[PDB]
Amino acid sequence: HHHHHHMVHITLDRNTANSWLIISKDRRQVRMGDTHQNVSDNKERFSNYPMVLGAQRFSSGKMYWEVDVTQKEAWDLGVCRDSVQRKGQFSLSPENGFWTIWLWQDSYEAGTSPQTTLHIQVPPCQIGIFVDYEAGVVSFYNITDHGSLIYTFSECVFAGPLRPFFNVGFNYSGGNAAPLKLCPL
Ligand SMILES: O=S1(=O)CCN(Cc2ccco2)CC1
The string of DSSP codes covering 13-44 is -GGGS-TTEEE-TTSSEEEE-SS--S----TT
CA distance 146 to 143: 6
Provide the residue range defining the domain that includes 126: 4-182
Alpha carbon of residue 166 to chain centroid: 3
CATH classification at residue 152:
2.60.120.920
- Across the beta sheet with 107-110, the strand order is 51-53, 162-167, 75-81, 98-104, 107-110, 116-117
Method by which the model was determined? X-ray
Segment holding 100, helix H or strand E: strand 98-104
Ligand 1 centroid distance, CA of 37 (Å): 12
Do 20 and 50 touch, CB atoms closer than 8 A?
Answer: yes
Q: How many domains does the chain have?
A: 1
Model resolution, angstroms: 1.3
3-state SS class at 4: helix
Residues within a 6 A CB radius of ligand 1:
18, 20, 32, 49-50, 170-172
Backbone phi, then psi, for 28, in 5-degree steps? Answer: -110, -10
Residue 149 one-letter amino acid:
L
- For the CA of 20, the closest atom of ligand 1 is 9
CA distance 74 to 94: 20
CA distance 20 to 176: 14
